[PDB]
Design a binder for these strands. Structure first.
Lengths: 142, 49, 61, 61, 22, 243, 61, 97, 141, 63
RNA sequence: AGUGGGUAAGAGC
RNA sequence: AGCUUUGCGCAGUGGCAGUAUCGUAGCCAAUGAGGUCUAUCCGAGGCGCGAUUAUUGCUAAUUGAAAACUUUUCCCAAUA
């Protein structure tokens, strides 16, 4: 709370000068009228946080809730939908054992992706609809 | 990206808060540090160079 | 969701009267307060429903 | 015992410092890994049929 | 035939480590 | 169930021990037009089959270093005699010495062999990675890209399939013959179901997702039913289902 | 029938309510409500509720 | 838990509960807030809290902190020895450590 | 413990079970001074507010209310009972006793999962719900 | 918007028709454009022209 | 060596 | 006389993004909000709380459901 405080004081200090340079309230009435509000701002900044109720966890849902479709729904379905390369990734060939190409983890495999018998003569291209991009606020900050 | 890296090297001195966690190996607690990606890329390039 | 002040105070009094290892002056066992009519309870069997009902009727003042 | 009733009246209600974004955060949605990862994994592992002679132990239809 | 894993201490010392591998 | 490679539906666990397969578990049956015939796994008259141990499928460091030195001397000789005749090493003479040198020869033919040469101090970075990632790295000491693959499990899994009686016996332990699939060749698995994959992210609760995570376990138990759901393994009273 | 007539009447009554100017001064609103013959406060209602009540009363009359 | 109960009991015994029953949950909230503030190593000072009540809460927090430290440095050493421990126990001990 | 509401006679327990039409009633049967009951009390109080929407918590002292001890086998140090629309709900916890939670659970997340699964199963009209987490083994290692 | 929606609620206003353009054609009238494509094209072009001419006549009246 | 940790819930007759 | 500049409404066309839009009889704010550059310089809202399918409406299928099933005093053991 220091830097902010300084700014406030500076501003009020300026006012005092803008009064003192013209020789007004020589007793200091403007001084008190500014110091009391400075103390008030400091108290407000240091005030204890208010009482905030906690949100109870929502009940489990059942039945049907009508959700709209359209361009946003289409875009979200494209973003979260299963891609061709991802669909081919979780297909594992029966019987034909594949050597684990990831030394750092044996639990990771590409499945049919790059494996013989995958049914794709050509290579499965990358669905650019699943490209990784930053948020709007991250773009603003950048 | 390289221009941002050079600007951060030349000017940036204050950084954001980095989180800390501890991996438990039941013999010692290894610190793991969480750094913002924006600074992470600069640090990675600096380390490689 | 929580009981009012009277209920909390009474519950703490009841717990203190039982947990003498935390309260009081005399240290008895974990669940003893120190230091005619016996209630009849249904066993959950429909056959004994009538017997419990008539026992409760006899329990009247 | 020396506390007066007015001082009892003056105890303030406890407030929570953290704001809405921490008390009741919005759902942290999950997203699948981009296909670029699988593309890079499959592209890696391909082997050149030849090596540059400069290299040493430590460097269609 | 119990299905439990047996410790090979004091076992299979007639075999090296580079065997059964080309 | 445990030592069956994951493609055949098993867990594919590596065994650094001594596990014997009872002989009674190496017999299968097949029905042809003449009738039902029974087969054992091996003509060998020995003790009960022992699954191959990972012990014998790792080459010792002394052998590794001697082989690496010999291979690198051979590669240096080949390179120095090929500079004169002006031909690049084209993977043909470097076939016997394929997975021998410690900086495995496969790294010479790696796709990103040019951009890796400017990656310096990678062992130290790998060691220090434990201070950035929340998961401990078992291979904190070597890099697959830079150093190559230092271990081959092809022979181990080959001999583990061989010891278990092969695909025929392993599938005899499973429900494979209950699917009436004519052969085991043109088949594939699917790691997650359509609803299971679509439910990996639908804003579920902790209980819901925790229950959903056990579906592959259900598929695994069903695949191994003719073996797990057996009287011998689970002694005691048997109960039939309602219908 | 009467149902369509009454719902339409309430429809244009609400539409008239949205297009009526009411002063933001609490004192003037209180004086106007007193002049209209209605109590200023309805079971401890808020000033916005008082302004809405005055607007509805003006709309009806 | 017992410690908290004990402290709570004491306060409700000297709180004129027939006049101030509504403050029991307030007192418990103050106790929890003081414990959280000590656990987070952040300054804690309720301005309107009475001095005897503040002393009560401070002593309770000191006792709870001593128990917390001893429990952490006991469970950690039990785990190091190879003892059989649950999963939530390890998470709680790691948080405390 | 002391924070949660307490029921003093069996009729109050019956009224509490009957009066809930759309929330699962979770009743802890035991003694407030029992350490295992203390763990149940502290966990329930920790999650008494999170699951307020679809649950409610009541505390019953079986010494002052023994009226169910015979019928509900209320003899373990601490038991947990779940009711929905005046119907006791069983949970296949994996311990062999689907009627009640007779042991102390340390994790409040596990109890929230149990309550939510009970609510989901009993809302659908079912009387027995499968617990999200198995409890035939304490998973200590 | 609330006024229009509540007018639709009370039956004074017909429910709004989907706004169809050439790109929107096969999405709104896909199951029916195969019946008779030229009539569908005429209908969607008529709707687009109706919107356009409403805009133009509003401008002209405002002139 | 050993008990268990193996109760489907529901509808009234 | 045309053209043109800015702000503001009404619209029509098109693009993009859904980790966000909105609410403020809550407080503070050009008498300075907020400052990591560049500080004898910057200059606008921030904070807290609340709403939600990360703005909200409809429209159409879908299923949950909805309608009902014998919703009516059966057995085991024994007399006569």
């Amino acid at each position: 709370l220091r830097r902010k405080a300084a700014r406030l004081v500076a501003a009020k200090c300026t006012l005092a000068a803008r009064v003192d340079s013209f020789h007004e309230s020589t007793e200091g009435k403007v001084g008190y009228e500014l110091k009391d509000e400075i103390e008030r701002k400091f108290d407000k900044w240091q005030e204890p946080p208010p009482v905030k109720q906690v949100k109870p966890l929502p009940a489990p849902l059942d039945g049907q809730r009508k959700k709209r479709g359209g361009r946003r729904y289409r875009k979200m379905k494209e973003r979260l939908g299963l891609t061709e390369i991802r669909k081919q990734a979780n297909r594992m060939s029966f019987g034909e054992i594949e050597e684990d190409a990831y030394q750092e983890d044996l639990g990771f495999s590409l499945g049919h992706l790059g494996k013989s018998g995958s049914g794709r003569v050509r290579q499965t291209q990358v669905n650019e609809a699943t490209k990784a991009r930053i948020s709007k606020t991250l773009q603003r900050t950048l | 990206a390289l221009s941002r890296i050079k600007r951060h090297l030349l000017t940036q001195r204050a950084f954001k808060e980095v989180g800390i966690e501890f991996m438990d190996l039941y013999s010692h607690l290894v610190p793991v540090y969480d750094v913002e990606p924006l600074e992470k890329i600069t640090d990675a390039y600096l380390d490689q160079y | 969701v929580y009981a009012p002040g009277l209920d909390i105070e009474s519950s703490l009094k009841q717990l203190a009267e039982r947990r003498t290892d935390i309260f009081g002056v005399e240290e008895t066992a974990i669940g003893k307060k120190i230091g005619p009519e016996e209630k009849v309870t249904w066993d959950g069997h429909s056959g004994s429903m009538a017997r419990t009902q008539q026992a409760a009727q006899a329990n009247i003042t | 015992a020396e506390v007066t009733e007015e001082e009892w009246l003056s105890i303030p209600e406890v407030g929570d410092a953290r704001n809405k974004r921490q008390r009741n955060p919005r759902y942290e949605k999950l997203t699948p890994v981009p296909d670029s990862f699988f593309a890079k994994h499959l592209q890696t592992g391909e082997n050149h049929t030849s090596v540059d002679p400069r290299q040493t132990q430590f460097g269609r239809n | 035939p119990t299905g439990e894993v047996l410790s090979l201490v004091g076992k299979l010392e007639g075999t090296r480590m580079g065997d059964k591998a080309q | 169930v445990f030592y069956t490679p994951k493609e055949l539906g098993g867990l594919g666990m590596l065994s650094m021990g001594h596990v014997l397969i009872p002989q009674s578990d190496l017999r299968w049956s097949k029905q042809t037009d003449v009738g039902i015939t029974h087969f054992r796994s091996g003509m060998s008259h020995e003790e009960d089959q022992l699954i191959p141990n990972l012990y014998r499928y790792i080459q010792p460091w002394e052998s590794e270093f001697i082989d690496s030195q010999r291979v690198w001397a051979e590669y240096a000789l080949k390179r120095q005699e090929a500079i004169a005749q002006n031909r690049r090493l084209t993977l043909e003479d470097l076939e016997d010495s394929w997975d021998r040198g410690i900086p495995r020869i496969n790294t010479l033919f790696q796709k990103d062999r040019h951009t890796l040469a400017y990656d310096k101090g990678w062992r130290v970075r790998t060691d220090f990675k434990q201070y950035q990632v929340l998961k401990q790295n078992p291979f904190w000491w070597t890099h697959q890209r830079h150093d190559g693959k230092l271990w081959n499990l092809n022979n181990y899994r080959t001999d583990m399939i061989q010891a278990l009686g092969g695909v025929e016996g392993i599938l005899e332990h499973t429900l494979f013959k209950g699917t009436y699939f004519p052969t085991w060749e043109g088949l594939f698995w699917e790691k997650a179901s359509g609803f299971e994959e679509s439910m990996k992210w639908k804003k579920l609760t902790n209980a819901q997702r925790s229950g959903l995570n056990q579906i592959p376990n259900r598929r695994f138990t069903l695949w191994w039913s003719p073996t797990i759901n057996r009287a011998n393994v689970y002694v005691g009273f048997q109960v039939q289902l309602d219908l | 029938s009467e149902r369509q007539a009454e719902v339409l009447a309430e429809f244009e009554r609400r539409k008239r309510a949205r297009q009526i100017n009411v002063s933001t001064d609490d004192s003037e609103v209180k004086a106007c409500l007193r002049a209209l013959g209605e109590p200023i406060t309805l079971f401890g209602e808020g000033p916005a509720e008082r302004r809405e009540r005055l607007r509805n009363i003006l709309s009806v009359v | 838990l017992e410690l908290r109960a004990a402290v709570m009991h004491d306060i409700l015994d000297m709180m004129p509960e027939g006049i101030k029953q509504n403050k029991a949950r307030t007192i418990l909230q103050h106790l929890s807030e003081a414990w959280r503030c000590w656990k987070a190593n952040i300054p804690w000072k309720v301005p309107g809290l009475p001095t005897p009540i503040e002393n009560m809460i401070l002593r309770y927090v000191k006792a709870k902190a001593d128990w917390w430290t001893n429990t952490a440095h006991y469970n950690r050493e039990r785990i190091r020895r190879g003892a059989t421990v649950d999963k939530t126990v390890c998470k709680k001990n790691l948080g405390r450590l | 413990s002391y924070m949660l509401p307490h029921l003093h006679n069996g009729w109050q327990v019956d009224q509490a079970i009957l009066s809930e039409e759309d929330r699962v009633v979770v009743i802890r049967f035991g003694h407030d001074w029992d350490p295992t009951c203390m763990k149940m009390d502290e966990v329930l109080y920790s999650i008494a507010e999170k699951v307020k929407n679809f649950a409610v918590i009541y505390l019953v002292d079986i010494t002052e209310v023994p009226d169910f001890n015979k019928m509900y086998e209320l003899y373990d140090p601490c038991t947990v009972m779940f009711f929905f629309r005046n119907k006791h709900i069983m949970i296949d916890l994996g311990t062999g006793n689907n009627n009640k939670i007779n042991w102390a659970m340390e994790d409040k997340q596990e109890m929230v999962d149990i309550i939510e699964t009970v609510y989901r199963g009993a809302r659908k009209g079912r009387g027995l719900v499968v617990s999200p987490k198995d409890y035939s083994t304490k998973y200590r290692y | 918007q609330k006024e229009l929606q509540e007018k639709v609620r009370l039956g004074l206003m017909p429910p709004p028709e989907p706004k169809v353009r050439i790109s929107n054609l096969m999405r709104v009238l896909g199951t029916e454009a195969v019946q008779d494509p030229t009539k569908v094209e005429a209908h969607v072009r008529a709707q687009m022209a109706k919107r356009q001419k409403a805009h133009e006549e509003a401008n002209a009246a405002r002139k």
